[PDB]
């Protein structure tokens, strides 16, 4: 069930399940980052644009990389 | 070609493409086709007062390939 | 919110959210793998004991490693 | 020391530890304390007819440290 079809809520809920990322789902939801948009993001986007610390940003981007490899 | 588009042409393109709320950003800043196509990724993501999800799609799936 | 306190259902639902692992949450639930037990597993356990292919097993174990590093 | 435990001692230990359903496996195979403590991880996970979650905790948090 490819991430490209995930809703914004699914992306947010996934991020909240990562350790130390519970506080960060809300910004993804408010920015309307659905699965299609999620796959376009980089770690720099998460740190510099979304103002998320490097540690959680790395966990999110590592998930993005895994999701992209599965497309 | 899109480099010849007027501001109204840019607004129409993004309305037809399913970004009607974001299209107003191009109207507000009077961004014509030549300026649109030169926009850098960071300009689209942080300089239009639009949500990041739409902005990512606008850049990667439209500006980059027009 | 540490994975050590996750329920069996939370572990299963997390696994199902990984690409290509939708079919594999059920075995984790039936084996009563809660968060505490999840952190004790290796990729060999997932492949050899649970009979899950290497690809999905690697995605699950990579998650386990991230969860353990956060404890 | 646990190497001296009877089968009934093993069953009691795992009942008290919150593994009453799994304790029956040690009764069924008549596993005393000496045999319990020698059990290898794969033996616990695949040779007792118990669920994997409990089995992992039984090995890592009990057998390994008793």
Curated annotation (Swiss-Prot), chains A, C:
Residues 6-70 form the SAM domain. It is found in: Nucleus. It comes from the Eukaryota. Interacts with RNF2. Interacts (via SAM domain) with SAMD1 (via SAM domain); the interaction mediates L3MBTL3 binding to chromatin. Interacts with RBPJ; the interaction is required for L3MBTL3 localization to chromatin and is impaired by Notch-derived peptides containing the intracellular domain (NICD). Interacts (via SAM domain) with KDM1A. Interacts with DCAF5. Interacts with DNMT1. Interacts with E2F1. Interacts with SOX2. Interacts with SFMBT1. Is a negative regulator of Notch target genes expression, required for RBPJ-mediated transcriptional repression. It recruits KDM1A to Notch-responsive elements and promotes KDM1A-mediated H3K4me demethylation. Involved in the regulation of ubiquitin-dependent degradation of a set of methylated non-histone proteins, including SOX2, DNMT1 and E2F1. It acts as an adapter recruiting the CRL4-DCAF5 E3 ubiquitin ligase complex to methylated target proteins. Required for normal maturation of myeloid progenitor cells. This is Lethal(3)malignant brain tumor-like protein 3. It comes from Homo sapiens (Human). The lineage of its organism: Eukaryota, Metazoa, Chordata, Craniata, Vertebrata. The chain holds residues 705 to 773 of 780 of the full protein.
From Swiss-Prot, chains B, D:
Expressed in atherosclerotic lesions, not in normal intima. Expressed in foam cells. Disulfide bonds: none annotated. Residues 5-66 form the SAM domain. It is found in: Nucleus; Chromosome; Secreted. Induction: Expression is inhibited by miRNA MIR378C. Homopolymerize into a closed pentameric ring. Interacts (via SAM domain) with L3MBTL3 (via SAM domain); the interaction mediates L3MBTL3 binding to chromatin. Interacts (via WH domain) with KDM1A; the interaction modulates KDM1A function. Winged-helix (WH) domain directly recognizes and binds unmethylated CpG-containing DNA via simultaneous interactions with both the major and the minor groove of DNA. Unmethylated CpG islands (CGIs)-binding protein which localizes to H3K4me3-decorated CGIs, where it acts as a transcriptional repressor. Tethers L3MBTL3 to chromatin and interacts with the KDM1A histone demethylase complex to modulate H3K4me2 and H3K4me3 levels at CGIs. Plays a role in atherogenesis by binding with LDL on cell surface and promoting LDL oxidation which leads to the formation of foam cell. This is Sterile alpha motif domain-containing protein 1. It comes from Homo sapiens (Human). The chain holds residues 459 to 523 of 538 of the full protein.
